[PDB]
Design a protein around this ligand. Structure first.
Ligand SMILES: *P(=O)(O)OCC(C)(C)[C@@H](O)C(=O)NCCC(=O)NCCS
Ligand SMILES: N[C@H](C(=O)O)[C@H](O)Cc1ccc([N+](=O)[O-])cc1
Ligand SMILES: [Cl-]
Length: 1332
């Protein structure tokens, strides 16, 4: 008893239907294709064919209607055909007009209840006639269109010759529906289901070539690249070597290309599967297509032939299970929701290879739009000639500009060409990016300055010169250099009495911070030895272990601290012991150098330990090198006075020590008691007249808090420099500092370093400009004799603006780790960029390389965490919390929730909890918002002065509603989801929310449904309603980091939407709005035009409140009238208008005459002329063209009277004017001299030109325009860093240079110049097992 006349939708239909309702203004789900042929086709018989065939089908006889409260489809008495002929043979570019038409036609939405699914055409050009068909994706997919087109072709061919056409092979779509119902009740569905549930079990944050959230709801922007024959020939060769189709090689390359561009191992490619073979759908035009994940593991170590084989099998498994809807995979895996997705970029394995023959001439079937564009999609396509291939890029026009798309295709073709060169080559040797995309790196150059060889040579140099200059100060006591030198020389003779050992030795120091410790360092260095600091408060196990690890010849301590040392047999020197005190005083004060004994430059100086603990071996050369290479920018003065605020176990102390004593300055030992009390520190620094001052950023924040409460002192300062240490800066917190010392002359010096590169590797001067721009933590540029490269997980350089790990090549590299060669081998590694046997150092710190050459420090990758769905650096979040005014500093930790995965927790310190959340949700995404906070006096200081995250107090369901609005919504979600306790902040799709249930809600709330997908929390739902609620002014983007707000006035006949293509070609430095004149929406034409002064008046009111920045008004064609009238009426309103931009207009000599000319023409005449210069080319129906003609004359009459009224001596409005004319515009002739006629409105006018642009350049050339407008008036996501040197599963070489260093190296990377293989391919543990 099943009927024939009203049928349910298939599972494929039901999904297109939903997508069609999500943006009711969108044509995105239409489909279209054409067939070019060289022949003259009969127009009347061709529509007979379309109309015959359309009735031979079923899906094209359908109209759709809602019921069941689902959606049903009903047949129609007759198949409507919409057929048009258009002859472009009279335009100069006929072929480009035809493609222009087709691109416009496919952008007209279809009313599924209309019942009109067939819009066809015959488009005649000089070479080819194009047979064109569009429809809606619900009734046809790509392969269906081609079926219908082959049938039209057959019917046509018969009709010309008066033959009877052969019977249709088309089956009935009603038994496709039974089959679909059958399958979803079968076992195969529950098999296929669990195949994908497993296959996709891991998928999280699928990669894309651009970071994007919102679901694609718009037609693609295309680019078409021919493939060179040489490459086509090589794919078939490369394919036969691997035993597969050539099309699989291309999938493999494209998959490898995504991985190599994102530097990510987990790649998921969407593949449309035809899903027709094997069943009844083969013969029936319909939509069965399914876009499914292809997961590849793109290892930098993987050979090309291997990935091609992964594709071969992955697709094989896809084709087995392909009947299971990908939309249901996505619902099952909870990948529908906030920015979540199943498939990434797409490519097709189904190419239309069969020429379709209309009469005596064949053509190729080419597809204009198959669906909404998600990230990037490639479509393989053939040519009219045999063995010819072409790529068609298709992208989401919201995320990708047309030149950005062309670039990826250009990059890709070159990558493919390299990919098929050697099947045995690993992809990790291949670069996705082209040379133009890279940034020049600083190559190490020698430093032309010289001080000396060792530290003692250069220090002794300074005692000769100025022996009575002051050296060190502790509390009230001060010593000149000569006394300091003598005291050290005396203690260094005592060392030589107290051990027989000689050579480069190691002397452990357990000491308080006092002058004994300064003397003991110098003594150690004078004696030919290296100092090994230990903190007197260290745990006794660590003292024990350091001493044994360095095999101390001597241990130098005090009477009180000697009790912290075992009786192990080590020799001690106790400085404050009265007998030892005297034994040294009686010693000769002559230098050991006077006897010919001292360190060499390559001998060690100190060994500092990091966190088991690892010791770092530094040389005299390393340290003096630092200062030799920094004199250029830093300019060391002998009258500087430095500050030692940092423990001697931390290499800051080496910097702030030898900064004075190499150069002639006086060092101030700051007791640790006063360093942790920021007020007295400020007392002490001014009192003692300090110049150079080091601090760790978290400490400096506590320091300004003291500068606040004591203005007496802060204006008494005299600092040549203010320096920043081994954390990252958050310049946002520096606002109050420039409010004080902007004119003091004190610079701000930021220095990135790490203990393995000799204290510091980079410098930036922080000025008043870059505090509030917020470009991130900026570490500046590399020291002269160092170098830094930023590399991907394959050890290749990353392009401009991309994450990577920093590798420090240079001469500040430590000799290595103490007794850990295995660390020397995986940390200090062979250097491909540089001289033969040199080596590079893994920082493990993440960085971006910006195109100008500055480095942005992003964070240490060890500590990068992952919350639900997202990887986040804790340092970007700790910054977001310092923006909130009372927040001074903060720290974020992590903990494991209940019986759950992960959550964030923050500890903030005040200056002078729920208000923080509010400010935060307006700032950051919901995923960054810590779970719960805590109030703390200060932050746990670490032994070396950093934030101790291991001591933080541990501070251990979902949040309820707020106002009556919220609960009003919550019960509505239960209506759909049921009685499941939901939280205000919960996600709708995780709590049982269905894809359809979300339309029912956003209906009930009268809100766009895309809003809810992109943000499925009832908080965002409420906040959308109350915080938002006849719109005179249309906003495109109002970003937060916006300097300039561009308000745009449309041309004649245009709406505000004509600036959209500009608004998203404009950098995010700009905010862009357009004012919508009434009656100018061709969709709602039935309101009434208004005059100038009214529009201008109602546009200041909304615009004084809604302006996001200083305004720059843009005008085009007749909009320039309303533009100048705007800047003028703003200027008087007490508004921030800084300028005006004038497109496509020159002032007219006789304004009285244009006004008499315009009033004498019909709008229908004005528009027909604008259409011949290339306007309104996308308007294909007479009804809306009529509407536009009416607007056109209004806008023209209004502009003409305006410029007629105010004459040749206007009211001078006095701003700068940016005049932009297109060089092909017939309405701006003789522009070279005539632009100057705009001087009438102000003194400063400058011209820009777009030579190949015409009058409508604001649309066609928009990219070029934003380039101009930004010149004058003015990202991917965070990935996982998998370092190949740490990759257990790969194979490794162990290398050697001639001078005895060893390095681990991955097999897949080519060998560096000066390095030799000591151990054949093996595992990581094996290779490290082979070092002697
Ligand atoms: P809901 O879970 O159904 O999500 C809405 C959706 C728009 C994401 C979903 O309906 C969908 O993916 N529709 C697209 C259908 C489609 O594009 N078919 C073409 C396959 S070749
Ligand atoms: N190597 C250390 C680390 O590994 O974190 C720091 O980066 C070094 C440092 C340099 C300069 C200053 N300072 O204050 O001038 C403090 C700290
Ligand atoms: Cl290791």
């Amino acid at each position: 008893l099943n009927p024939a006349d009203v049928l349910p939708l298939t599972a494929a239909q039901n999904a297109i239907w939903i997508g069609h309702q999500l943006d009711p203004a969108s044509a995105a789900y239409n489909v279209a294709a054409h067939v070019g042929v060289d022949a003259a086709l009969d127009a009347d018989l061709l529509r007979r064919a379309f109309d015959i065939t359309a009735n031979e089908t079923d899906c094209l006889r359908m109209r759709f209607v809602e019921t069941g409260s689902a959606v049903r489809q009903t047949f129609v008495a007759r198949a409507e055909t919409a057929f048009v002929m258009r002859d472009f043979r009279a335009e100069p570019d006929s072929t480009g007009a035809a493609h222009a038409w087709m691109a416009a036609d496919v952008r007209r939405r279809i009313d599924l209840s209309s019942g009109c699914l067939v819009h066809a055409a015959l488009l005649r050009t000089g070479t080819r006639d194009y047979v064109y068909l569009r429809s809606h994706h619900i009734a046809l997919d790509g392969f269906g269109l081609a079926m219908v087109l082959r049938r039209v072709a057959h019917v046509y061919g018969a009709l010309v010759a008066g033959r009877e056409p052969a019977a249709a092979a088309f089956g009935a779509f009603a038994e496709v529906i039974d089959a679909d119902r059958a399958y979803h009740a079968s076992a195969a569905c529950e098999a296929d289901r669990a195949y994908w549930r497993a296959y996709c079990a891991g998928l999280d944050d699928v990669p894309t070539l651009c970071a994007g959230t919102s679901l694609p709801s718009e037609i693609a922007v295309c680019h078409t690249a021919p493939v060179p024959a040489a490459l086509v020939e090589r794919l078939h060769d490369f394919a036969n070597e691997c035993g597969t189709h050539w099309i699989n090689v291309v999938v493999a390359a494209f998959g490898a290309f995504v991985g190599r561009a994102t530097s990510r191992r987990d790649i998921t490619i969407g593949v449309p599967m035809m899903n027709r073979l094997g069943g009844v759908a083969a013969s029936v035009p319909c939509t069965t297509a399914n876009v499914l994940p292809l997961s590849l593991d793109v290892r930098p170590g993987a050979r090309a032939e291997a990935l091609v084989e992964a594709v071969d099998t992955g697709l094989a498994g896809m084709r087995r299970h392909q009947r299971y809807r990908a939309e249901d995979i996505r619902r099952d895996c909870h990948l529908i929701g906030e920015g979540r997705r199943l498939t990434g970029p797409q490519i097709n394995v189904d190419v239309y290879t069969d020429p379709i023959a209309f009469g005596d001439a064949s053509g190729i079937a080419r597809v204009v739009s198959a669906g909404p564009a998600d990230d990037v999609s490639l479509m393989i396509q053939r040519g009219d000639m045999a063995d010819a291939l072409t790529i068609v890029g298709m992208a989401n026009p919201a995320l990708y500009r047309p030149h950005e798309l062309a670039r990826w295709i250009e990059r890709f073709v070159a990558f493919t060409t390299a990919f098929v060169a050697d099947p045995s080559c690993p992809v990790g040797r291949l670069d996705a990016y082209l040379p133009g995309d890279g940034v020049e790196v600083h190559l190490p150059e020698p430093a032309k300055r010289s001080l000396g060889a060792t530290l003692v040579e250069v220090f002794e140099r300074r005692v000769a010169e100025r022996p009575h200059a002051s050296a060190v100060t502790l509390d009230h006591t001060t010593w000149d250099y000569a006394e300091l030198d003598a005291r050290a020389n005396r203690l260094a003779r005592h060392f030589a009495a107290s051990t027989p050992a000689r050579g480069n030795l190691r002397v452990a120091l357990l000491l308080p911070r006092t002058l004994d410790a300064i003397v003991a360092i110098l003594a150690t260095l004078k004696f030919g030895a290296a100092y090994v600091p230990i903190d007197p408060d260290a745990p006794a196990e660590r003292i024990r272990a350091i001493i044994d690890d360095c095999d101390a010849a001597l241990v130098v301590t005090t009477v009180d601290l000697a009790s912290r040392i075992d009786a192990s047999g080590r020799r001690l020197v106790v400085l404050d012991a009265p007998d030892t005190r005297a034994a040294v005083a009686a010693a000769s004060a002559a230098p050991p150098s006077r006897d010919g004994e001292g360190p060499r430059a390559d001998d060690l100086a100190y060994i500092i330990f990091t966190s088991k603990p690892k010791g770092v071996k530094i040389t005299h050369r390393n340290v003096v090198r630092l200062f030799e290479a920094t004199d250029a920018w830093f300019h060391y003065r002998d009258d500087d006075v430095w500050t030692m605020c940092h423990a001697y176990v931390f290499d800051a102390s080496v910097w702030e020590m030898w900064g004075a004593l190499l150069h002639g300055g006086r060092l101030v030992v700051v007791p640790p008691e006063t360093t942790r009390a920021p007020d007295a520190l400020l007392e002490l620094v001014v009192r003692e007249g300090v110049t150079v001052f080091g601090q760790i950023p978290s400490a400096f924040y506590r320091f300004m808090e003291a500068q606040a409460d004591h203005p007496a002192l802060r204006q008494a300062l005299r600092l040549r420099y203010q320096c920043f240490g081994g954390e990252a800066l958050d310049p946002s917190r520096l606002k109050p500092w420039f409010d004080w010392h902007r004119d003091s002359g004190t610079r701000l010096l930021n220095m990135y370093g790490i203990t393995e590169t000799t204290i510091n590797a980079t410098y930036r001067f922080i000025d008043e400009r870059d505090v509030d721009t917020g470009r991130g933590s900026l570490i500046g540029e590399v020291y002269a004799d160092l170098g830094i490269v930023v590399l991907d997980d394959a050890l290749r350089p990353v392009p401009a603006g991309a994450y990577g790990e920093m590798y420090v090549t240079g001469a500040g590299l430590a000799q290595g780790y103490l007794n850990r060669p295995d660390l020397d081998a995986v940390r200090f590694v062979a250097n491909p960029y540089g001289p033969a046997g040199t080596r590079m150092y893994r920082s493990g710190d993440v960085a971006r390389l910006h195109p100008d050459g500055v480095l942005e420090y992003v964070g240490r990758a060890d500590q990068q965490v992952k919350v639900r769905g997202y990887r986040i650096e804790l340092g970007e979040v700790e910054a977001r919390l310092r923006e909130y005014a009372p927040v001074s500093d903060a720290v974020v930790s992590v903990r494991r929730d209940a019986v759950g995965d992960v959550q964030l927790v923050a500890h903030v310190v005040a200056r002078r909890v729920e208000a923080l959340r509010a400010h935060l949700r307006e700032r950051v995404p919901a995923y960054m918002v810590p779970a719960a906070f805590g109030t703390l006096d200060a932050l746990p200081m670490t032994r070396n002065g950093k934030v101790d995250r291991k001591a933080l107090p541990d501070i251990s369901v979902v949040e309820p509603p707020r106002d009556a609005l919220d609960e009003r919504i919550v019960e509505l979600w239960r209506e759909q989801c049921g009685d499941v306790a939901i939280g205000i902040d919960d996600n709708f799709f995780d709590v049982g929310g269905d894809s359809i249930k979300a339309i029912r809600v956003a209906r009930a709330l009268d809100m766009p449904v895309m809003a809810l997908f992109d943000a499925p929390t009832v908080r965002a739902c409420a906040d959308y309603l109350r915080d938002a609620l006849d719109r005179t002014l249309h906003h495109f983007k109002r970003p937060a980091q916006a300097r300039v707000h561009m308000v745009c006035v449309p041309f004649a006949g245009g709406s505000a939407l004509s600036y959209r293509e500009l608004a998203r070609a404009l950098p995010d430095g700009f905010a862009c709005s357009a004012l919508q004149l009434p009656g100018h929406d061709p969709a709602a034409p039935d309101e009434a035009f208004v005059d100038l002064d009214t529009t201008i008046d109602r546009a200041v009111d909304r615009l004084l409140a809604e302006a996001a920045a200083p305004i720059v008004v843009y005008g085009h064609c007749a909009g320039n009238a309303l533009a100048v009238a705007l800047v003028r009426r703003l200027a008087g309103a007490g508004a921030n208008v800084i300028g005006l931009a004038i497109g496509g207009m020159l002032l007219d000599e006789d304004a009285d005459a244009v006004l008499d000319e315009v009033g004498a023409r019909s709008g229908e005449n004005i528009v027909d002329f604008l259409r011949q210069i290339g306007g309104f080319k996308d308007v294909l129906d007479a009804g809306t063209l009529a509407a536009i003609a009416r607007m056109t004359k209004h806008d023209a009459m209004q502009a003409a009277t305006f410029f007629a009224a105010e004459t040749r001596a206007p009211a001078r409005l006095d701003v700068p004017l940016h005049v932009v004319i297109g060089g092909q515009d017939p309405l701006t002739p003789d522009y070279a001299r005539r632009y100057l006629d705009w001087r009438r409105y102000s003194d400063a006018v400058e011209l820009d030109v777009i030579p190949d642009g015409g009058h409508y350049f604001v649309t066609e050339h928009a990219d070029t325009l934003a380039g101009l407008l930004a010149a004058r008036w003015l990202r991917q996501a965070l990935r996982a860093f998998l370092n190949p040197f740490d990759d257990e599963d790969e194979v490794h070489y162990l290398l050697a240079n001639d001078l005895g260093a060893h390095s681990l190296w991955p097999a897949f990377v080519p060998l560096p110049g000066g390095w030799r293989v000591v151990a054949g391919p093996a595992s990581r543990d094996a290779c490290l097992g082979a070092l002697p």
